[PDB]
Design an enzyme around this catalytic site. Structure first.
Site, PDB file in Angstrom:
ATOM      1  N   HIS A 117     -15.959   4.184 -22.325  1.00  0.00           N
ATOM      2  CA  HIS A 117     -17.123   3.521 -22.911  1.00  0.00           C
ATOM      3  C   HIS A 117     -18.377   4.252 -22.421  1.00  0.00           C
ATOM      4  O   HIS A 117     -19.241   4.632 -23.213  1.00  0.00           O
ATOM      5  CB  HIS A 117     -17.159   2.049 -22.464  1.00  0.00           C
ATOM      6  N   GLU A 118     -18.458   4.466 -21.111  1.00  0.00           N
ATOM      7  CA  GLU A 118     -19.618   5.136 -20.524  1.00  0.00           C
ATOM      8  C   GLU A 118     -19.786   6.586 -20.969  1.00  0.00           C
ATOM      9  O   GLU A 118     -20.891   7.007 -21.310  1.00  0.00           O
ATOM     10  CB  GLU A 118     -19.555   5.088 -18.992  1.00  0.00           C
TER      11      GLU A 118
ATOM     12  N   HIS B  21     -21.286   6.929 -24.306  1.00  0.00           N
ATOM     13  CA  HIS B  21     -22.733   6.725 -24.417  1.00  0.00           C
ATOM     14  C   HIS B  21     -23.400   8.099 -24.367  1.00  0.00           C
ATOM     15  O   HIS B  21     -24.404   8.340 -25.031  1.00  0.00           O
ATOM     16  CB  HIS B  21     -23.272   5.864 -23.270  1.00  0.00           C
TER      17      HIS B  21
ATOM     18  N   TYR C 211     -31.420   2.285 -27.978  1.00  0.00           N
ATOM     19  CA  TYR C 211     -30.765   1.146 -27.340  1.00  0.00           C
ATOM     20  C   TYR C 211     -31.506  -0.175 -27.501  1.00  0.00           C
ATOM     21  O   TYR C 211     -31.874  -0.824 -26.514  1.00  0.00           O
ATOM     22  CB  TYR C 211     -30.554   1.437 -25.856  1.00  0.00           C
TER      23      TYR C 211
ATOM     24  N   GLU D 130     -23.527   0.355 -28.792  1.00  0.00           N
ATOM     25  CA  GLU D 130     -22.542  -0.357 -27.980  1.00  0.00           C
ATOM     26  C   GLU D 130     -21.152  -0.389 -28.611  1.00  0.00           C
ATOM     27  O   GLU D 130     -20.154  -0.115 -27.943  1.00  0.00           O
ATOM     28  CB  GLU D 130     -23.014  -1.788 -27.709  1.00  0.00           C
TER      29      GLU D 130
ATOM     30  N   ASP E 289     -31.101  -9.116 -23.708  1.00  0.00           N
ATOM     31  CA  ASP E 289     -30.140  -8.022 -23.818  1.00  0.00           C
ATOM     32  C   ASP E 289     -30.589  -6.985 -24.853  1.00  0.00           C
ATOM     33  O   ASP E 289     -29.803  -6.535 -25.686  1.00  0.00           O
ATOM     34  CB  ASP E 289     -28.773  -8.622 -24.186  1.00  0.00           C
TER      35      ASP E 289
ATOM     36  N   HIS F 131     -25.216  -6.044 -26.580  1.00  0.00           N
ATOM     37  CA  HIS F 131     -23.843  -6.302 -26.150  1.00  0.00           C
ATOM     38  C   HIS F 131     -23.256  -7.528 -26.844  1.00  0.00           C
ATOM     39  O   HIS F 131     -22.077  -7.842 -26.679  1.00  0.00           O
ATOM     40  CB  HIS F 131     -23.764  -6.505 -24.633  1.00  0.00           C
TER      41      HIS F 131
END
Ligand SMILES: [Ca+2]
Ligand SMILES: [Ca+2]
Ligand SMILES: [Ca+2]
Ligand SMILES: [Ca+2]
Ligand SMILES: [Zn+2]
Length: 316
Positions: free
Chosen positions: A142-143, A146, A157, A166, A226, A231
């Site tokens: 996931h990271e 990005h 974002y 996301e 958020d 998210h």
């Protein structure tokens, strides 16, 4: 550093043993020279200063509890690199074999992992909500995704573009989990989330609503928390991706699944060829349809399924 490439052995966060690529020069370092310009793992030593010190070990054996997060961060970054290279013909996150750097043991009781624009960072968790985050392959993927997004589409974002950002990370995080065949599922973070509770996860792609996230555009979050619900609203796109791959009937709309491989090809093309920094959900639909069209033809089942999936989640 400059040294001799070798292979060490260690144990990850979940207690599993695995071999990791290291470099020898007085000490054995967590530096993998077999992938692109290298994969480097650092020790943040419970501080917030980055990146910290390149991980050095005296005997090339990583079985200490303190070593676990580093072993997994190093190993899973390698798996993710392999996925992008072998499946999508992409060399590292920038497409030019950029070195991949990760720091573990960030801060104290930090329940988060993130890409800071230059490297990946992993907290150890508080032991209640999370255990060391690098223990989850979908978390690591996931990271790193990005980073891929930042170098390609550049999705801002915030609001809808952020939710897409996301979802893309959850989607490829899940595809990498399937690629590694490590107890694959359509859940996010299940391996490192709430060690005292089994069967749960942070997010669900198959059923976002299970954890309160929206699974239809009509239920999208419109507040300011958020970053506009990046998210939260990602659930709408995650559900669409799940339907495209696995199929099913959602809110009365039936979708014929086309599989994970095609899902990956369609979204990767959309991400690298059609999406822009300010793309919204509607534009994502258009990009996905165009991508499926480029790959399988305008009258293909693939294009049909992409359209049905977005219709199912209310994205026109
Ligand atoms: Ca050692
Ligand atoms: Ca899993
Ligand atoms: Ca998972
Ligand atoms: Ca749990
Ligand atoms: Zn993310």
């Amino acid at each position: 550093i400059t040294g001799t490439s070798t292979v060490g052995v260690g144990r990850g966060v979940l207690g599993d043993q695995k071999n990791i690529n290291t470099t020898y020069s007085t000490y054995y370092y967590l530096q993998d020279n077999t992938r692109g310009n290298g994969i480097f793992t650092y020790d943040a030593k419970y501080r917030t200063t980055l990146p910290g010190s390149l991980w050095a070990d005296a005997d090339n054996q990583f079985f200490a509890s303190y070593d676990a997060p580093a072993v997994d961060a190093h190993y899973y970054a390698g798996v993710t690199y392999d996925y992008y290279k072998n499946v999508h013909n992409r060399l590292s996150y920038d497409g030019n074999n950029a070195a991949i750097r990760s720091s573990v043991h960030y801060s104290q009781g930090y329940n988060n992992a993130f890409w800071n624009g230059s490297q990946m960072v992993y907290g150890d968790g508080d032991g209640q909500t999370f255990i060391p985050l690098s223990g989850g392959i979908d978390v690591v993927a996931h990271e790193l995704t990005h980073a891929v997004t930042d170098y390609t589409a550049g999705l801002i974002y915030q609001n809808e573009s952020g939710a897409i950002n996301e979802a893309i990370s959850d989607i490829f995080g899940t595809l990498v989990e399937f690629y590694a065949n490590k107890n694959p599922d359509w859940e996010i973070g299940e391996d490192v989330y709430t060690p005292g509770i089994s069967g749960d996860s942070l997010r669900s792609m198959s059923d976002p609503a299970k954890y309160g996230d929206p699974d239809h555009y009509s239920k999208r979050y419109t507040g300011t928390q958020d970053n506009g619900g990046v998210h939260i609203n990602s659930g709408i796109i995650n559900k669409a991706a799940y339907l495209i791959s696995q199929g099913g009937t959602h809110y009365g709309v039936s979708v014929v699944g086309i599989g994970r491989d095609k899902l990956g090809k369609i979204f990767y093309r959309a991400l690298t060829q059609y999406l822009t920094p300010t793309s919204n959900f509607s534009q994502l639909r258009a990009a996905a349809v165009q991508s499926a069209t480029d790959l399988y033809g305008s009258t293909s089942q693939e294009v049909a399924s992409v359209k049905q999936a977005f219709d199912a989640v209310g994205v026109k």
